[PDB]
Coordinates of N, CA and C and ligand atoms in Angstrom, one line a residue:
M1 N -7.8 -18.1 -10.5 CA -6.7 -18.6 -9.3 C -5.3 -18.1 -9.9
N2 N -4.6 -17.2 -9.0 CA -3.4 -16.4 -9.1 C -2.5 -17.3 -7.7
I3 N -1.5 -18.0 -8.1 CA -0.9 -18.7 -7.1 C 0.8 -18.3 -7.4
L4 N 1.2 -18.4 -6.2 CA 2.9 -17.9 -6.4 C 3.3 -19.5 -5.7
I5 N 4.5 -20.1 -6.1 CA 5.1 -21.3 -5.6 C 6.4 -21.1 -5.3
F6 N 6.9 -21.3 -4.1 CA 8.3 -21.7 -3.7 C 9.0 -22.9 -3.5
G7 N 10.0 -23.1 -3.8 CA 10.8 -24.4 -3.2 C 12.2 -24.3 -3.8
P8 N 12.8 -25.0 -2.7 CA 14.4 -25.1 -3.6 C 14.4 -26.2 -4.5
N9 N 15.8 -26.0 -5.2 CA 16.4 -27.0 -6.1 C 16.3 -28.5 -5.3
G10 N 15.7 -29.4 -5.8 CA 15.7 -30.8 -5.2 C 14.3 -31.0 -4.4
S11 N 13.5 -30.4 -4.7 CA 11.9 -30.4 -3.7 C 11.0 -30.6 -4.9
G12 N 11.2 -31.1 -6.0 CA 9.8 -31.3 -6.9 C 9.5 -30.3 -7.3
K13 N 9.8 -28.9 -7.0 CA 8.7 -27.9 -7.3 C 8.0 -28.0 -8.7
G14 N 9.1 -28.0 -9.8 CA 8.5 -28.0 -11.3 C 7.4 -29.1 -11.5
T15 N 7.5 -30.4 -10.9 CA 6.8 -31.3 -11.2 C 5.4 -31.1 -10.4
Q16 N 5.3 -30.5 -9.3 CA 3.8 -30.1 -8.8 C 3.4 -28.8 -9.2
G17 N 4.2 -27.9 -9.7 CA 3.8 -26.8 -10.4 C 2.9 -27.1 -11.4
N18 N 3.5 -28.1 -12.3 CA 2.8 -28.7 -13.4 C 1.5 -29.2 -13.1
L19 N 1.5 -30.2 -12.5 CA 0.1 -30.6 -11.8 C -0.9 -29.4 -11.4
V20 N -0.7 -28.7 -10.6 CA -1.4 -27.5 -10.5 C -1.8 -26.7 -11.6
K21 N -1.1 -26.2 -12.6 CA -1.2 -25.4 -13.6 C -2.4 -26.3 -14.6
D22 N -1.9 -27.7 -14.5 CA -2.8 -28.4 -15.3 C -4.7 -28.5 -15.0
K23 N -4.8 -29.3 -13.7 CA -6.0 -28.9 -13.0 C -5.8 -27.6 -12.7
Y24 N -7.0 -26.8 -12.9 CA -7.0 -25.4 -12.7 C -6.7 -24.4 -13.9
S25 N -6.1 -25.0 -15.3 CA -5.9 -24.2 -16.2 C -4.9 -23.1 -16.4
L26 N -4.1 -23.1 -15.5 CA -3.2 -21.7 -14.9 C -2.3 -21.4 -16.3
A27 N -1.8 -20.1 -16.6 CA -0.7 -20.1 -17.2 C 0.7 -20.1 -16.3
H28 N 1.7 -21.0 -16.3 CA 2.8 -21.2 -15.8 C 3.9 -19.9 -16.1
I29 N 4.0 -19.1 -15.1 CA 4.9 -17.8 -15.4 C 6.1 -17.9 -14.6
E30 N 7.4 -18.6 -15.4 CA 8.7 -18.4 -14.5 C 9.5 -17.1 -15.2
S31 N 10.4 -16.8 -14.5 CA 11.4 -15.9 -14.4 C 12.1 -15.6 -15.5
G32 N 12.5 -16.7 -15.8 CA 13.3 -16.8 -17.5 C 12.3 -16.6 -18.6
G33 N 11.1 -17.2 -18.8 CA 10.1 -16.7 -19.7 C 9.6 -15.4 -19.8
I34 N 9.5 -14.6 -18.8 CA 9.3 -13.2 -18.5 C 10.2 -12.5 -19.3
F35 N 11.4 -12.6 -19.2 CA 12.7 -12.0 -19.8 C 12.9 -12.2 -21.5
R36 N 12.4 -13.4 -21.8 CA 12.3 -13.6 -23.1 C 11.0 -13.1 -23.8
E37 N 10.2 -12.9 -23.1 CA 9.1 -12.3 -23.6 C 9.2 -10.5 -24.1
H38 N 10.1 -10.0 -23.3 CA 10.2 -8.8 -23.0 C 11.5 -8.2 -23.5
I39 N 12.7 -9.2 -23.3 CA 13.7 -8.8 -24.1 C 13.9 -9.0 -25.5
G40 N 13.8 -10.3 -25.2 CA 13.4 -11.0 -26.6 C 12.2 -10.3 -27.7
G41 N 11.4 -9.8 -27.1 CA 10.3 -9.3 -27.9 C 10.1 -7.8 -28.0
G42 N 10.9 -7.2 -27.1 CA 11.3 -5.8 -27.2 C 10.0 -4.8 -26.8
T43 N 9.5 -5.1 -25.8 CA 8.7 -4.2 -25.0 C 9.6 -2.9 -24.7
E44 N 8.7 -1.7 -24.3 CA 9.7 -0.9 -23.9 C 10.4 -1.2 -22.4
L45 N 10.0 -2.1 -21.8 CA 10.6 -2.4 -20.4 C 11.7 -3.4 -20.7
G46 N 11.4 -4.2 -21.6 CA 12.5 -5.1 -22.2 C 13.8 -4.4 -22.9
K47 N 13.8 -3.4 -23.8 CA 14.7 -2.7 -24.1 C 15.5 -2.0 -23.1
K48 N 14.8 -1.5 -22.1 CA 15.5 -1.1 -20.7 C 16.3 -1.9 -20.1
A49 N 15.8 -3.1 -20.0 CA 16.3 -4.0 -19.2 C 17.6 -5.0 -20.1
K50 N 17.4 -4.6 -21.2 CA 18.6 -5.3 -22.0 C 19.8 -4.5 -22.1
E51 N 19.6 -3.2 -21.6 CA 20.9 -2.6 -21.6 C 21.8 -2.9 -20.3
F52 N 20.9 -3.2 -19.2 CA 21.5 -3.8 -18.1 C 22.4 -5.4 -18.3
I53 N 21.6 -6.2 -18.9 CA 22.0 -7.2 -19.2 C 23.3 -7.5 -19.9
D54 N 23.2 -6.5 -21.2 CA 24.4 -6.7 -22.0 C 25.6 -6.2 -21.7
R55 N 25.5 -5.5 -20.3 CA 27.0 -4.9 -19.6 C 27.3 -5.5 -18.3
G56 N 26.5 -6.8 -18.2 CA 26.7 -7.7 -17.1 C 25.9 -7.2 -15.8
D57 N 25.2 -6.4 -15.8 CA 24.4 -6.1 -14.7 C 23.2 -6.6 -14.7
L58 N 22.8 -6.7 -13.3 CA 21.2 -7.2 -13.0 C 20.1 -6.1 -13.4
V59 N 18.6 -6.4 -13.9 CA 17.9 -5.7 -14.3 C 17.5 -5.0 -13.0
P60 N 17.2 -3.5 -12.6 CA 16.8 -3.0 -11.4 C 15.4 -3.8 -10.9
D61 N 15.1 -3.5 -10.1 CA 13.7 -4.0 -9.4 C 12.7 -3.1 -9.7
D62 N 13.1 -2.2 -10.4 CA 11.8 -1.0 -10.6 C 11.8 -1.3 -12.2
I63 N 12.4 -2.3 -12.7 CA 12.2 -2.4 -14.0 C 11.7 -3.8 -13.9
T64 N 12.4 -4.8 -13.2 CA 11.7 -6.1 -13.0 C 10.5 -6.2 -12.7
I65 N 9.8 -5.6 -11.8 CA 8.6 -6.1 -11.1 C 7.4 -5.4 -12.4
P66 N 7.4 -4.0 -12.9 CA 6.7 -4.0 -13.9 C 6.8 -4.9 -15.3
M67 N 7.8 -5.4 -15.3 CA 7.9 -6.5 -16.2 C 7.1 -7.8 -15.7
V68 N 7.4 -8.0 -14.5 CA 6.2 -9.4 -14.1 C 5.0 -9.1 -14.3
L69 N 4.7 -7.8 -13.7 CA 3.1 -7.4 -13.5 C 2.6 -7.4 -15.1
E70 N 3.3 -7.1 -16.1 CA 2.9 -7.0 -17.4 C 2.6 -8.1 -18.0
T71 N 3.4 -9.2 -17.8 CA 3.3 -10.7 -18.2 C 2.1 -11.3 -17.7
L72 N 1.8 -11.1 -16.2 CA 0.7 -11.7 -15.5 C -0.7 -11.1 -16.0
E73 N -0.6 -9.7 -16.6 CA -1.7 -9.2 -17.0 C -2.2 -9.7 -18.7
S74 N -1.0 -10.0 -19.3 CA -1.0 -10.4 -20.7 C -1.2 -11.8 -20.7
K75 N -0.2 -12.5 -20.7 CA -0.1 -14.2 -20.2 C -0.9 -14.5 -19.6
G76 N -1.0 -14.2 -18.2 CA -1.7 -14.7 -17.3 C -3.1 -14.2 -16.8
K77 N -3.6 -13.8 -17.7 CA -5.0 -13.4 -17.5 C -6.1 -13.8 -17.1
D78 N -6.1 -15.4 -17.6 CA -7.0 -16.2 -17.6 C -6.8 -16.9 -16.2
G79 N -5.6 -16.8 -15.2 CA -5.1 -17.4 -14.0 C -3.6 -17.9 -14.3
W80 N -3.0 -17.4 -13.1 CA -1.6 -17.8 -13.3 C -0.5 -18.2 -12.2
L81 N 0.5 -19.0 -12.4 CA 1.1 -19.9 -11.4 C 2.7 -19.0 -11.6
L82 N 3.0 -18.3 -10.7 CA 4.4 -17.6 -10.7 C 5.4 -18.2 -9.8
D83 N 6.7 -18.5 -10.5 CA 7.2 -19.7 -9.9 C 8.9 -19.0 -10.1
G84 N 9.3 -18.8 -9.3 CA 11.0 -18.5 -9.3 C 11.3 -17.2 -9.0
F85 N 10.1 -16.1 -8.7 CA 10.1 -14.7 -8.5 C 8.8 -14.7 -7.5
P86 N 9.3 -14.0 -6.5 CA 10.5 -13.2 -6.0 C 11.6 -14.2 -5.4
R87 N 12.7 -13.8 -5.4 CA 13.6 -14.4 -4.7 C 14.2 -13.8 -3.4
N88 N 14.0 -12.7 -3.2 CA 14.5 -11.9 -1.7 C 13.1 -11.1 -1.5
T89 N 13.7 -10.5 -0.1 CA 12.4 -9.8 0.6 C 12.1 -8.5 -0.1
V90 N 13.1 -8.0 -0.3 CA 12.8 -6.4 -1.3 C 12.1 -6.8 -2.7
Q91 N 12.3 -7.7 -3.3 CA 11.4 -8.3 -4.6 C 10.1 -8.6 -4.2
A92 N 10.0 -9.4 -3.0 CA 8.6 -9.8 -2.5 C 7.5 -8.7 -2.2
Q93 N 8.3 -8.0 -1.3 CA 7.6 -6.6 -0.8 C 7.0 -5.9 -2.2
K94 N 8.0 -5.6 -2.9 CA 7.8 -4.8 -4.4 C 6.9 -5.5 -4.9
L95 N 6.8 -6.9 -5.3 CA 5.8 -7.2 -5.9 C 4.2 -7.2 -5.4
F96 N 4.3 -7.3 -4.0 CA 3.1 -7.3 -3.4 C 2.6 -6.1 -3.4
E97 N 3.3 -5.1 -3.2 CA 2.6 -3.4 -3.5 C 2.2 -3.2 -5.0
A98 N 3.0 -3.8 -5.9 CA 2.6 -3.8 -7.4 C 1.2 -4.5 -7.7
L99 N 1.1 -5.5 -7.1 CA 0.0 -6.1 -7.2 C -1.2 -5.7 -6.8
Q100 N -1.1 -5.1 -5.5 CA -2.2 -4.2 -4.7 C -2.7 -3.1 -5.6
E101 N -1.6 -2.4 -6.0 CA -1.8 -1.1 -7.0 C -2.6 -1.5 -8.4
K102 N -2.5 -2.6 -9.1 CA -3.1 -2.9 -9.8 C -4.5 -3.7 -9.8
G103 N -4.7 -3.7 -8.6 CA -6.0 -4.4 -7.8 C -6.1 -5.9 -8.2
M104 N -4.6 -6.7 -8.7 CA -4.5 -8.2 -9.0 C -4.5 -9.0 -7.6
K105 N -5.2 -9.8 -7.3 CA -5.0 -10.7 -6.1 C -4.6 -12.0 -5.9
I106 N -3.8 -12.5 -4.8 CA -3.4 -13.5 -4.9 C -4.3 -14.6 -4.5
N107 N -4.5 -16.1 -4.4 CA -5.5 -16.6 -4.1 C -4.7 -17.6 -2.8
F108 N -3.6 -18.0 -3.5 CA -2.6 -19.3 -2.6 C -1.4 -19.0 -3.1
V109 N -0.7 -19.2 -2.0 CA 0.9 -19.6 -1.9 C 1.4 -20.9 -1.3
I110 N 1.9 -21.5 -2.0 CA 2.6 -22.8 -1.9 C 4.1 -23.0 -1.5
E111 N 4.3 -23.4 -0.6 CA 5.9 -23.6 -0.1 C 6.0 -25.4 -0.1
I112 N 7.1 -25.8 -0.7 CA 7.4 -27.0 -0.5 C 8.6 -26.9 0.3
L113 N 8.3 -27.6 1.5 CA 9.7 -27.6 2.6 C 10.4 -29.1 2.7
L114 N 11.9 -28.6 2.8 CA 12.6 -29.8 2.7 C 13.7 -29.1 3.2
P115 N 14.3 -29.8 4.4 CA 15.4 -29.5 4.9 C 16.7 -29.2 3.8
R116 N 17.9 -28.4 3.8 CA 18.7 -28.1 3.1 C 19.4 -29.4 2.5
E117 N 20.0 -30.2 3.6 CA 20.8 -31.3 3.2 C 20.3 -32.5 2.8
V118 N 18.8 -32.4 2.8 CA 18.1 -33.5 2.0 C 18.0 -33.2 0.6
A119 N 17.4 -31.6 0.4 CA 17.3 -31.5 -0.8 C 18.8 -31.3 -1.8
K120 N 19.8 -31.3 -1.2 CA 21.4 -31.4 -1.8 C 21.5 -33.0 -2.3
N121 N 21.1 -34.0 -1.1 CA 21.3 -35.3 -1.1 C 20.5 -36.0 -2.5
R122 N 19.3 -35.6 -2.3 CA 18.3 -35.9 -3.4 C 18.6 -35.2 -5.0
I123 N 19.2 -34.1 -5.0 CA 19.7 -33.5 -6.2 C 21.3 -34.6 -6.7
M124 N 22.0 -34.6 -5.7 CA 23.3 -35.5 -6.1 C 22.9 -36.9 -6.4
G125 N 22.0 -37.5 -5.8 CA 21.7 -39.0 -5.8 C 21.0 -39.3 -7.1
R126 N 20.5 -38.3 -7.8 CA 19.7 -38.7 -9.2 C 20.8 -39.8 -10.0
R127 N 20.3 -40.4 -10.6 CA 21.0 -41.6 -11.5 C 20.1 -41.8 -12.7
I128 N 20.8 -41.5 -14.1 CA 19.9 -41.7 -15.2 C 20.1 -42.8 -16.1
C129 N 19.1 -43.5 -16.4 CA 18.7 -44.6 -17.0 C 19.7 -44.6 -18.7
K130 N 20.4 -45.3 -19.0 CA 21.0 -45.1 -20.6 C 20.1 -45.3 -21.6
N131 N 18.9 -46.1 -21.1 CA 18.0 -46.9 -22.0 C 16.6 -46.0 -22.3
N132 N 16.3 -45.3 -21.0 CA 14.9 -44.3 -20.9 C 15.3 -43.7 -19.6
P133 N 15.3 -42.3 -20.2 CA 16.2 -41.2 -18.9 C 14.7 -40.8 -18.2
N134 N 13.2 -41.1 -18.5 CA 12.3 -40.9 -17.8 C 12.2 -42.0 -16.5
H135 N 13.0 -42.9 -16.7 CA 13.1 -44.0 -15.3 C 13.7 -43.5 -14.1
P136 N 12.8 -43.2 -13.1 CA 13.0 -42.6 -11.9 C 14.0 -43.6 -10.9
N137 N 15.2 -43.1 -10.8 CA 16.4 -43.8 -9.9 C 17.1 -42.8 -9.3
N138 N 17.0 -42.9 -7.8 CA 18.0 -41.7 -7.1 C 18.5 -42.7 -5.7
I139 N 20.1 -42.7 -5.5 CA 20.4 -43.2 -4.4 C 19.8 -42.7 -3.1
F140 N 19.4 -42.0 -2.9 CA 18.7 -40.9 -1.6 C 17.2 -41.1 -1.5
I141 N 16.8 -41.5 -2.1 CA 15.2 -41.5 -2.4 C 14.9 -42.8 -2.2
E142 N 15.0 -43.7 -1.1 CA 14.4 -45.3 -0.9 C 13.6 -45.8 -1.7
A143 N 12.2 -45.2 -2.3 CA 11.4 -45.9 -3.0 C 11.8 -45.8 -4.4
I144 N 12.8 -45.1 -4.9 CA 13.1 -45.3 -6.1 C 14.7 -45.4 -6.1
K145 N 15.3 -46.1 -5.1 CA 16.8 -46.9 -5.1 C 16.9 -47.6 -6.3
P146 N 18.4 -47.6 -6.7 CA 18.5 -48.4 -8.2 C 18.8 -49.8 -7.8
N147 N 18.7 -50.7 -8.7 CA 18.6 -51.8 -8.3 C 20.1 -52.7 -8.5
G148 N 20.8 -52.6 -7.1 CA 22.2 -52.5 -7.3 C 23.0 -51.4 -7.9
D149 N 23.6 -51.8 -9.0 CA 24.5 -50.4 -10.0 C 23.2 -50.0 -10.9
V150 N 22.2 -51.0 -11.4 CA 21.3 -50.8 -12.6 C 20.0 -50.1 -12.3
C151 N 19.4 -49.6 -13.2 CA 17.9 -48.8 -13.4 C 17.2 -50.0 -12.7
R152 N 16.4 -49.4 -11.6 CA 15.3 -50.3 -11.0 C 14.1 -50.6 -12.0
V153 N 14.0 -50.1 -12.9 CA 12.9 -50.1 -13.7 C 13.1 -51.0 -15.2
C154 N 14.2 -51.0 -15.8 CA 14.6 -51.9 -16.9 C 15.9 -52.5 -17.0
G155 N 16.8 -52.3 -16.0 CA 18.0 -52.8 -15.8 C 19.2 -52.3 -16.8
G156 N 18.9 -51.2 -16.9 CA 19.7 -50.3 -18.1 C 20.9 -50.0 -17.2
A157 N 22.0 -49.4 -18.0 CA 22.9 -48.7 -17.0 C 22.6 -47.3 -16.4
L158 N 23.2 -46.9 -15.5 CA 23.0 -45.5 -15.0 C 24.1 -44.7 -14.9
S159 N 24.1 -43.6 -15.0 CA 25.1 -42.6 -14.3 C 24.6 -41.2 -14.0
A160 N 25.5 -41.0 -13.6 CA 25.5 -39.4 -12.6 C 25.6 -38.5 -13.8
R161 N 24.6 -37.2 -13.9 CA 25.0 -36.3 -14.5 C 25.9 -35.2 -13.9
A162 N 27.0 -34.5 -14.5 CA 27.9 -33.6 -14.0 C 27.2 -32.5 -12.9
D163 N 25.9 -31.8 -13.8 CA 25.5 -30.7 -12.9 C 24.7 -31.2 -11.6
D164 N 24.4 -32.4 -11.6 CA 24.1 -32.7 -10.3 C 24.9 -33.2 -9.1
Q165 N 26.1 -33.2 -9.8 CA 27.3 -33.6 -8.5 C 28.3 -32.4 -8.4
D166 N 27.9 -31.0 -8.9 CA 28.4 -29.7 -8.9 C 28.1 -29.2 -7.6
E167 N 28.7 -29.3 -6.2 CA 28.4 -29.1 -4.9 C 28.3 -27.6 -5.0
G168 N 29.1 -26.8 -5.6 CA 29.5 -25.5 -5.3 C 28.2 -24.7 -5.9
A169 N 27.9 -25.0 -7.3 CA 26.9 -24.8 -7.8 C 25.6 -24.7 -7.0
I170 N 25.3 -25.9 -6.5 CA 24.3 -26.3 -5.7 C 23.8 -25.3 -4.3
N171 N 25.4 -25.5 -3.5 CA 25.3 -24.7 -2.4 C 25.1 -23.2 -2.5
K172 N 25.5 -22.5 -3.7 CA 25.3 -21.1 -3.9 C 23.7 -20.9 -4.1
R173 N 22.9 -21.9 -5.1 CA 21.8 -21.6 -5.0 C 21.0 -21.9 -3.7
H174 N 21.0 -22.9 -3.1 CA 20.6 -23.0 -1.7 C 21.0 -22.0 -0.7
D175 N 22.1 -21.7 -0.9 CA 22.6 -20.3 0.4 C 21.4 -19.2 0.0
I176 N 21.3 -18.8 -1.1 CA 19.8 -17.8 -1.6 C 18.6 -18.1 -1.0
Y177 N 18.2 -19.5 -1.4 CA 16.9 -20.1 -1.1 C 16.9 -20.2 0.4
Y178 N 17.8 -20.7 1.3 CA 17.7 -20.8 2.6 C 17.9 -19.9 3.7
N179 N 18.2 -18.4 2.9 CA 18.6 -17.2 3.5 C 17.3 -16.7 4.2
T180 N 17.4 -16.9 5.5 CA 16.3 -16.3 6.5 C 16.1 -14.9 6.6
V181 N 17.3 -14.3 6.2 CA 17.4 -12.8 6.6 C 16.4 -12.0 5.7
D182 N 17.0 -12.5 4.3 CA 16.5 -11.7 3.3 C 16.4 -12.5 1.9
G183 N 16.4 -13.7 2.0 CA 16.5 -14.8 0.7 C 15.2 -15.3 0.8
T184 N 14.8 -16.5 -0.1 CA 13.6 -16.8 -0.8 C 12.8 -17.4 0.7
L185 N 13.2 -17.9 1.4 CA 12.7 -18.2 2.6 C 11.9 -17.2 3.2
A186 N 12.9 -16.0 3.4 CA 12.5 -15.0 4.0 C 11.2 -14.2 3.2
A187 N 11.3 -14.5 2.0 CA 10.5 -13.7 1.1 C 8.8 -14.8 0.8
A188 N 9.3 -16.0 1.4 CA 8.1 -16.9 1.7 C 7.1 -16.6 2.6
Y189 N 8.1 -16.2 3.8 CA 7.3 -16.0 5.0 C 6.8 -14.6 5.1
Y190 N 7.1 -13.8 4.1 CA 6.7 -12.4 3.8 C 5.0 -12.6 3.6
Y191 N 5.0 -13.5 2.8 CA 3.5 -14.1 2.2 C 2.8 -15.0 3.2
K192 N 3.6 -15.9 3.9 CA 2.8 -16.4 4.6 C 2.4 -15.8 6.1
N193 N 3.2 -14.9 6.7 CA 2.8 -14.4 7.6 C 1.6 -13.1 7.6
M194 N 1.3 -12.9 6.4 CA 0.0 -11.7 6.0 C -1.0 -12.6 5.5
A195 N -1.2 -13.7 4.9 CA -2.1 -14.5 4.2 C -3.6 -14.3 4.9
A196 N -3.9 -14.4 6.0 CA -5.3 -14.3 6.1 C -5.6 -12.9 6.4
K197 N -4.7 -11.9 6.5 CA -5.2 -10.3 6.3 C -5.3 -10.0 4.9
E198 N -4.9 -10.9 3.9 CA -4.9 -10.4 2.7 C -6.0 -11.4 1.9
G199 N -6.6 -12.5 2.6 CA -7.5 -13.1 1.8 C -6.9 -14.2 0.7
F200 N -5.7 -14.6 1.1 CA -5.0 -15.6 0.5 C -4.9 -16.5 1.5
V201 N -4.8 -18.1 0.9 CA -4.3 -19.2 1.8 C -2.9 -19.6 1.6
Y202 N -1.9 -19.9 2.7 CA -0.7 -20.2 2.6 C -0.7 -21.6 2.5
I203 N 0.0 -22.5 1.7 CA 0.0 -23.9 1.8 C 1.6 -24.6 1.9
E204 N 1.9 -25.5 3.0 CA 3.0 -25.7 3.0 C 3.0 -27.2 2.6
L205 N 4.0 -27.6 1.7 CA 3.9 -29.3 1.2 C 5.4 -29.8 1.9
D206 N 4.8 -30.8 2.2 CA 6.3 -31.6 2.9 C 6.7 -32.2 1.6
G207 N 8.1 -31.8 1.6 CA 8.7 -32.1 0.3 C 9.6 -33.8 0.1
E208 N 9.6 -34.4 1.3 CA 9.8 -35.8 1.4 C 9.2 -36.9 0.9
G209 N 7.8 -36.6 0.7 CA 6.8 -37.6 0.0 C 7.3 -37.6 -1.1
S210 N 6.6 -39.0 -1.7 CA 6.6 -39.3 -3.2 C 5.9 -38.2 -3.9
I211 N 5.9 -38.2 -5.5 CA 5.1 -37.2 -6.2 C 3.8 -37.3 -6.0
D212 N 3.4 -38.5 -6.4 CA 1.9 -38.6 -6.3 C 1.5 -38.4 -4.8
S213 N 2.1 -38.5 -3.8 CA 1.9 -38.1 -2.3 C 1.7 -36.7 -2.0
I214 N 2.7 -36.1 -2.6 CA 2.6 -34.5 -2.6 C 1.5 -33.8 -3.4
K215 N 1.3 -34.5 -4.5 CA 0.3 -34.2 -5.4 C -1.3 -34.1 -5.0
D216 N -1.5 -35.1 -4.2 CA -2.6 -35.5 -3.5 C -3.0 -34.4 -2.4
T217 N -2.0 -34.2 -1.4 CA -2.1 -33.2 -0.2 C -2.3 -32.1 -1.1
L218 N -1.6 -31.8 -1.8 CA -1.8 -30.2 -2.8 C -3.2 -30.0 -3.1
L219 N -3.9 -31.1 -4.2 CA -5.2 -30.9 -4.7 C -6.1 -30.8 -3.6
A220 N -5.9 -31.2 -2.6 CA -6.7 -31.3 -1.4 C -7.2 -29.9 -1.1
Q221 N -6.1 -29.4 -1.0 CA -6.0 -27.7 -0.4 C -6.6 -26.5 -1.3
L222 N -6.5 -27.0 -2.8 CA -6.7 -25.8 -4.1 C -8.2 -25.6 -4.0
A223 N -9.0 -26.4 -3.4 CA -10.4 -26.2 -2.8 C -10.8 -26.7 -1.5
Ligands
CO301 CO1 15.5 -47.9 -17.2

């Protein structure tokens, strides 16, 4: 099973990604990890890429795409979940042409849908418990609202994380994600629009439901 996943920050994408890569035994391949294996490990492509990075430029797509394809072929040989690439329509199209050339096939594309302002609030509304940071508390997700000012699990103190409160940072990432001209949504639609012509199934997940709720709907559809 080769699966591409798309979703904004605030959509719970990583959580769902992990449930999918576990049931199904996939290699989870994300954009960051690809660069490490290659730049870090100095494959022929990684050495060429690092020249760009070290002067503050982006790696050209003509180097990025084959870097991705190498990692899918090595790390992802027994099945992969590709997460966080492509981000735009040019990448998306070049990735798909490159997969077709290697005769590598997509089986599923998953998009987690959530309106922008909802995603941003779910990020900002996170509260971390002083006693156990795994305890879920969010001022904007009803089912896990804090108990007054304290953790709804253990009563410990709650704080906000500065990165969650940085609206500029959040907005710049959403601006790319929710860009329907040529951003990540446009890249997801590129897959959506050809799915049944190319023998894969596109799956839209409702990002507003609980973790367990999304996971059930997703599992149901992966067979
Ligand atoms: Co707690």
